[PDB]
Amino acid sequence: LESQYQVGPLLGSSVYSGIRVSDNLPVAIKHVEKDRISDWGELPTRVPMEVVLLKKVSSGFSGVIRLLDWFERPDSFVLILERPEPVQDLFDFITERGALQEELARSFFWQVLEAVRHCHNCGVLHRDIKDENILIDLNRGELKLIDFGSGALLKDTVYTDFDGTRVYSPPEWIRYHRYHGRSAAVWSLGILLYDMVCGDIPFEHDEEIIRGQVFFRQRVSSECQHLIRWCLALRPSDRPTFEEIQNHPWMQDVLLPQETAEIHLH
Numbered sequence: 001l002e003s004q005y006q007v008g009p010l011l012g013s014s015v016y017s018g019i020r021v022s023d024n025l026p027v028a029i030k031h032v033e034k035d036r037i038s039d040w041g042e043l044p045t046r047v048p049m050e051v052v053l054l055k056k057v058s059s060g061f062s063g064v065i066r067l068l069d070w071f072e073r074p075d076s077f078v079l080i081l082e083r084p085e086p087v088q089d090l091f092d093f094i095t096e097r098g099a100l101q102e103e104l105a106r107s108f109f110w111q112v113l114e115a116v117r118h119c120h121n122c123g124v125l126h127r128d129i130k131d132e133n134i135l136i137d138l139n140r141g142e143l144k145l146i147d148f149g150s151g152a153l154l155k156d157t158v159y160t161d162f163d164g165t166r167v168y169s170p171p172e173w174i175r176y177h178r179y180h181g182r183s184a185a186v187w188s189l190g191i192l193l194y195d196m197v198c199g200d201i202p203f204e205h206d207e208e209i210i211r212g213q214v215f216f217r218q219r220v221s222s223e224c225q226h227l228i229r230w231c232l233a234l235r236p237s238d239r240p241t242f243e244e245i246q247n248h249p250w251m252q253d254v255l256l257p258q259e260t261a262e263i264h265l266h
């Protein structure tokens with residue numbers, strides 16, 4: 001209730017810092033307006049799809065933000081989420097530090113891949129993978145995926161709706177308003193990896209997306225450029241599977257998260 005959490009300041013769009021009074025566990029308190037909800041689901045009881053998806057993934061593995069509880073109110077739902085502390089999102093981290101060293105981008109990108117695999121494996125498609133939806137636990141060197149608000153149940157048939165981020169959306173979406181979950185996710189991941197290693201996204205305009213040429217603006221190793229170009233293949237079915245990505249040579253010898261924090265974060 002109002003009395004089971006103390007409640008601090010806004011964190012962003014919706015979303016306050018809080019301390020669970022049972023044990024002052026740090027938490028994040030997210031408010032979503034019923035009028036602003038696109039997709040709904042049920043439990044055993046009508047809820048935002050977001051809550052369905054979160055319950056399906058909120059099961060131990062720390063690559064995804066865990067939903068600890070939720071409430072319904074007259075015109076909103078309120079979601080109690082886990083909150084690491086100290087923390088920073090990948091968009092701010094990149095904005096400050098600039099392009100990441102390959103070693104660090106490798107550790108981060110690997111952790112993202114583990115977390116997306118987990119979602120898919122729990123039957124959930126995120127649909128908005130990007131720097132702003134990735135939190136860094138700066139002490140442990142661990143990344144967490146957030147914001148399942150554009151997500152969907154994973155399926156093998158074609159999606160004809162998207163409401164994620166356009167500049168991370170694939171060309172098939174842009175030209176046909178059709179995509180398949182996995183292959184579009186792989187594309188978003190190619191966008192994200194370019195961002196990590198170049199300090200910014202590679203395409204701003206629809207036509208750049210559709211054209212698919214990748215220009216590297218920073219020094220990036222040949223293997224990393226190849227992986228990126230691969231994830232950004234124009235034909236969906238020419239993109240790598242999660243497994244091919246993780247067996248790519250650029251992905252070998254990844255640091256553990258703790259090592260990652262000691263070398264690059266502390």
Ligand SMILES: O=C1N=C(NCc2cccs2)S/C1=C\c1ccc2ncccc2c1
Pocket residue numbers: 011012013014015028030031032065081082083084087135146147148149
């Ligand atoms: O799930 C999340 N969605 C976020 N932003 C978009 C919206 C907010 C309200 C309606 S739509 S932020 C977020 C989760 C989250 C979880 C833990 C955090 N800890 C520290 C800082 C930010 C955090 C955000």
